[PDB]
Amino acid sequence: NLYFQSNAMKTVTVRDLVVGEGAPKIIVSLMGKTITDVKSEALAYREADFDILEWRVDHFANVTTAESVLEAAGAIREIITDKPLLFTFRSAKEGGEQALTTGQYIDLNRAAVDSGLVDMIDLELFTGDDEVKATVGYAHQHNVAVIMSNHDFHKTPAAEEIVQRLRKMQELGADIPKIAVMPQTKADVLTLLTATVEMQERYADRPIITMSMSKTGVISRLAGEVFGSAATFGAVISVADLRTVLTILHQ
Amino acid sequence: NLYFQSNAMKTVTVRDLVVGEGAPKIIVSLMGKTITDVKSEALAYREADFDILEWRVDHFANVTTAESVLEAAGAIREIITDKPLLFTFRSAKEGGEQALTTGQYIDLNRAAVDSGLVDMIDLELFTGDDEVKATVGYAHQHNVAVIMSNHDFHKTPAAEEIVQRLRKMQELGADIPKIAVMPQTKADVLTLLTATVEMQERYADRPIITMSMSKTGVISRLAGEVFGSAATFGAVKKASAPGQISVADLRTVLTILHQ
């Protein structure tokens, strides 16, 4: 593994994929419970037109068995060979499907880094500053990039607060700060876009990923090129529909 | 010669098209110089997928000859028989290709109303209140709906100023208030969307049409369903204003955002 990054165009290059340039990149998630499910999903998505494959490890039943995780990461990499693999255990605290102690979470991410099978890991901003700094360093030592994330599945913080969280991620060494918030009003969607523009403008020296969740916030999944979000998620609105709109907006 | 409107559904229904319900409607502008050009443009437009046909009369060379304007309107109506026809002279003050005195502009719009060939007229917010109220009344008496419009081609006013202009249009009797503004920054695009949401949620009792122009504001032409703009402009071959994308691409995106 070896990735690049530049503060000129504010990009991160993982594989041949330049995150931060051109149209936003599409991330799809594997949410299988067993290795059978994970393999069936990866094969099914192999033909889809997406850019980054995220493995949602919190959906994996054998997450506490080290060899099972390594086995599943290898299985995915065998099927999807030409795309960055992002390893993401979403914590219970931030909406994930299973609970792990801080120690288990950090060791899980360390094992993923050590495997050499994953290009990027997702680390949560509020895990703990000492733990985050240590793990970002460890990932970087092994040429693995870090998407640092934060979520609010029930409300949208003030724009100022969103910007300061994205800034903190940058200060903790995130290669790509990422935040997802839930709108309660239409104005909240615009608040998330405002924060995106303000961060991109005032502080960003690398790509950022932002999203306003739910049908109400779908705009935020399409307008990343103008507003400054480098990636968006879709499932196989759909991945096909997402690429269609992104291509039109790039023209 | 009869349109409907519902204050509660915030809709205006013209020639079976329900503006303000479902996905935003697509408006295309016909911009020919001579009657020959108008006829051939109407035929080319028949091949496209749009909801409302706007005739940009300020592009027509013989606008000062009443007979010529009526002939052109009739030629369009003969080709586009099932879609609403919107009559729009964009004033010189607000970017128009030619200038008319206020009195000439008012008489032009009254003649369009009288013709029975157009379903809607566009009147500019800053034309002159007393004459706009009189013309709105005249249009309504002949069952012609009024889109009232305002443009700022060099900047984006504050959100509250955009809202106030839209409210003033409603006050003047506009069936559909319309505003187009030019962003200088990315934040200006968001300002226009904020004004759209605030107007639609708090003060509107009818459909509104809003847009942030240029490539930078194109998202405002796509996200009307969520934010509250009832229609959007697309280009058949050439844009009538900066930021319009193809009608085909516009419908593709609107359909995706509808579900």
From Swiss-Prot, chain B:
Keywords: Amino-acid biosynthesis, Aromatic amino acid biosynthesis, Lyase, Schiff base. 3-dehydroquinate binds at S29, E54, W55, R56, R90, R221, S240, Q244. InterPro entries: 3-dehydroquinate_DH_AS, Aldolase_TIM, DHquinase_I, Type-I_3-dehydroquinase. Homodimer. Involved in the third step of the chorismate pathway, which leads to the biosynthesis of aromatic amino acids. Catalyzes the cis-dehydration of 3-dehydroquinate (DHQ) and introduces the first double bond of the aromatic ring to yield 3-dehydroshikimate. The reaction involves the formation of an imine intermediate between the keto group of 3-dehydroquinate and the epsilon-amino group of a Lys-178 at the active site. Belongs to the type-I 3-dehydroquinase family. This is 3-dehydroquinate dehydratase. It comes from Salmonella typhimurium (strain LT2 / SGSC1412 / ATCC 700720). The gene is aroD.
